[PDB]
Every structure is written in structure tokens, then in C-alpha cells.
Amino acid sequence: MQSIKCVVVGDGAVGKTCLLICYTTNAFPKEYIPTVFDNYSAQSAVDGRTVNLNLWDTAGLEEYDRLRTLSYPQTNVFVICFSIASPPSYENVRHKWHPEVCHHCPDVPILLVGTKKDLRAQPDTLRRLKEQGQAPITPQQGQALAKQIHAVRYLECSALQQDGVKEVFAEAVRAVLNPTP
Amino acid sequence: SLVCQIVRVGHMELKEGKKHTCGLRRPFGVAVMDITDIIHGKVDDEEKQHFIPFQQIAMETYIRQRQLIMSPLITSHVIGENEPLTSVLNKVIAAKEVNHKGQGLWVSLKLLPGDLTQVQKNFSHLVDRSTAIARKMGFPEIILPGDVRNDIYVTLIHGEFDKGKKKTPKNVEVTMSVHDEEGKLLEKAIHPGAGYEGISEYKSVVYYQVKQPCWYETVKVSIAIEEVTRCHIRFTFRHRSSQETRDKSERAFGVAFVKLMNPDGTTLQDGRHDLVVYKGDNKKMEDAKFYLTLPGTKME
Amino acid sequence: MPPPADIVKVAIEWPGAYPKLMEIDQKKPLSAIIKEVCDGWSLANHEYFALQHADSSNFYITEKNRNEIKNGTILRLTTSPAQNAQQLHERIQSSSMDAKLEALKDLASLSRDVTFAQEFINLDGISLLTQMVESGTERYQ
């Protein structure tokens, strides 16, 4: 067998719990589960190779940052899922999340994810961020964040629609499986 | 249904490389929502900023172009802004869900009973003296003796503009002017609508190379109720070409005029009325009185 | 009337042990939970060791206060309140000073722990303090 130490980080309540519980248990958290952090294991096939995944719903909280930084050592990949609905999460990724993780552990593969992808053309989140004076993360903006953090790829997921989930985590597997230049 | 419309005035197109004569009116679409509930007053709150999804005429030629290979045989023509606003009206009659993708607006609604006074008396907090007022283009079931108004809603409806020599159907801007019995244009005479002052002469929308465009464009008219008895309107139909010097130097290829009084004295009977667009001598068509002597419209 | 959230998503720690954030069951007798925690660090001797709030209290969790572990409340394994009490006492009646200083500051701090106090009072290590500061002067003066 093979399970990859994959810690998933991102701002508080931005879908880390949601996307991970969509991937591991295949149910969308309807309410915000307050992550402290949860260590899962799942099984999936990536491009013809079955693999186990030792995963982490890790805290968006700065408070359990330390506890999440406790998951920082030994970690083989950093799946950072930022809210498309909260480009402030984009900012904290390009200011804290990716910085903090590359400071405790540089050169580790990092997979950038746009959570709540279903909301980009959806009227609700558009108008919300507009009355919030912000724009839901356009795919090229997430590409810019990925190249910024030198991410393996920017992948968009909708935990509400189970969208992008399995592909995102197959990518998280393959990034350690086959490193990219 | 409450229906709003947007015309992008300014330049003929949002394309870089050439200037366009600033203030070029280009249609930008419509938003509609039923108000059968809103009229009945069920949604009763000042604070409800109803976001309304706005749909433009479908300019759907951005992502579909890139991926069509191994069997290319297609030539399609431009009706994506040549699309009729009558047709867009029919669509939004049918259309229930608007994938505006953020292009929309916000409105806070109520219904206040009583007349303009009570509107500006019982709820002047909503409606001060400076608050904008719109009136149904119609008449009331109750008539006060002395219902002093002089509104004349004049609606550009549609018109055939044959290409002629120009393969591009002439990019018709209609520009009509309110004159005395001496061709003398009057200022402010044409009122674009509510909450805004009238204008001396009015300019239509430039339909992008349309041979039989349809306007639905209505303007308020109000004149001295006795001087209107001796006034007329005259009309310039000009090909707003994309070249600024050419655009301004382009003249009204089309000429028209109309009188406000039937020579008997009656005001023109309401309803639809047709027009011949005029070419040729414009000194014949720019004379304070001679074109008055000339015939102006189809039926006459 | 209800018991607490019987399955609590908490970190479990131990000196030298990387914490593991497991979903601890709480209706189980706490001896077995200590057993599994010890086993997590490849340890036996569960009754010889106590979990405690890795938070400020350091109060060795008994069957009594296990309702006080919140989601995120880190638990840390250590020697049981009896084993802390004893380690103390044979360090306490002893004479080697700096060791007494450390154990003595720590007996101060941990005295308020009822869970520890049970076995340190069963033990009679306070009379061992009586030794260390009434004889322990004259052994060394």
C-alpha cells in the first residue's frame, strides 16, 4: 500500500472540512464543522494506480495553527484550498498559508484549490462579493496564485456539488507520485 | 413587469485602435421582473434591495469559436446585436432565469396609495419634492377637473432603411428637432424621460447595420399648449460610420418632417403613423417654410 | 441530563510523543482510554500513568473531569497522579538539593490538583517535606 501525508490548509470555514468530507466520506458538510484537525485515510485510483490517502482536515484557525503546524512536520503535500467566495482567503494563502507552510516545510508539493467553484457564475456569490466590493476568484487569478506559490496546479472544486473533489485529490496524489518541474 | 433597459452611449464599440465619436448610443440590453406580487404589495419593505438580474442581447461569440475542427463548413451572419429588442422582449417574456453573471442591479420597492401629494405628503421621507416622478403613459379612471398635464409620448417604433449603395445597412441615428413654424429648433423641447431635463434636439440609437430596425424608444414632449399649435418636428437619419471625421461629415442621408396640428386645427390623432424618409435637395428640406409646404408622411 | 459529546476530536500527547488528534470515546471507563493512549506511544502500565489537560490545569483526567475536554482540548499523557505523587515523595524526603527545588516548585504548583492530592496525601509526602526542610537543613547546613 501507499498513503501520502497530505495536509489540507486554508482559511477558516472555507471548505477544507467540506471538500475533504466530500472526498473521504462523499458527503457535503451542510453546517460549518469547526476543524481542529482530523486525520483520515481513503482509497482511490489515480491514472491507473490504486493508492491510499492519509489526509488532514486541518484548522483554518490561527489558534490551532500550532496544532496544524503539528501536522506540518513529515507532511509530503500541502493541499491549500482557498475560498473562491472569499478572495481574502486567496490573500491569506499568498500571505500566510503558503508562506507559513513553506517556512515550516519548503519544497513540499503544494496544490492550490479554489473551493466553492460552483459560485463563480452563480448569481448569489457574485452579488455578495460585489456588495462586498470583491470578485469571486476567476480561474486565471487562481492560476496566478498557483504560479505565485509555485503550486503544482490550481484546481477548482465545488463541495456543494461534489465538483472537482476527486480530481483535486488525485492531483494531490500524483504531485508526490510524479514531481513536476 | 418592471423592465429596465441600458444603452451604452459613448463609442460605437469597445474596440481599441480607433477613436469613436464620444456619445455613440449602443444598446446594451434589458432586465425584467414580474411585479404582479409587487403591485399587490405582498413584498412590503423599504430595505429589500431586490437584486435584479440583467440580460444583455446575447453577444455569445467568445468561447464557442476556439473548438470546432475536422469538419469546418459554416458561414453565419451577424444577429447577436442586430438582434431585435422586440425579439429580446419576446425572449424575456419566455426567459425565467437570467444568467447575468453579476451584471445586474439593486432596487428597494414599495407601493404608496394616493396621489403625488400623499406620496410627497404621507411618505415624503421616501419622496421629497426633488424625488423623481414617472407617470403611466395613459389616463386615470378618476379625473380631477384641472388634471393639468401636456405630456406627449412620441415613440420611435421601427423603420425600413434599405442598404442602397452601402452594403452595411446605414447605421441609422435618428435625430429629431422641434421647430416653430419657421424651422427654428427649440431647446429642451424633447425630454428623454423622468428625472432629467429635456434636450433641444434628440438622437436615436445607432442600430449596428440594420435594414429594418425597431426602436420602441419613447420620449416625452411638452410645449406651450398654444405654441405647440404652431410647431413641427424635423428628422435627420444619419449613417454613424465608425470613422470619426466620416461620422460627423456624414450627413442625414434621410430627411423627414411632421406637423403638430392637422391644418384644420385638430391635434394629430394618436396611434401609429408612418413616415417617408427623404433624400435629394436639402435646401428644399431646410427651409423655414418651404418643406412645411412640402408633403411629409405616407398617408398625407 | 445528557452526557457530553462522547466522541470528542482532541489531541492526545505524551512527553516525547507526537500528539495524535483522535476522536476519543468518553463513556468508556477511563482506565481503558489511558490504556489505548499508552499503546499509542507503545506503552503499557495504564494505571501507572494519567492523561491530563495538556492545557493549563495539568489535572490528571479521572472518570470525573473527562466531561471537560472540548474539541481542540489537547490531552497529554504523563505519570499517573499516584506516580507523580511518588516520584515527588522519594525526591522530597531526599537530600540532593536542586532536584528537591524542582520537585518542590512542582509540588507547589500541582498541590491544587485534587486528582494528584488524593495519592500524594495517601502517600504522606508532606511529612517528607517536613524532612527535607527540618532535617534537610542539618544534613547539609
Ligand SMILES: Nc1nc2c(ncn2[C@@H]2O[C@H](COP(=O)(O)OP(=O)(O)OP(=O)(O)O)[C@@H](O)[C@H]2O)c(=O)[nH]1
Ligand atoms: N455552497 C458551497 N459551500 C461550500 C463549499 N465548500 C465549502 N463550503 C462552505 O464552507 C463552510 C465551512 O466549511 P469548511 O469550508 O469545510 O470549513 P474549513 O475549510 O475546514 O475551515 P475550518 O474548519 O474553520 O478550519 C460550509 O458552511 C459551507 O457552506 C462548496 O463547494 N459549495
Ligand SMILES: [Mg+2]
Ligand atoms: Mg478547516
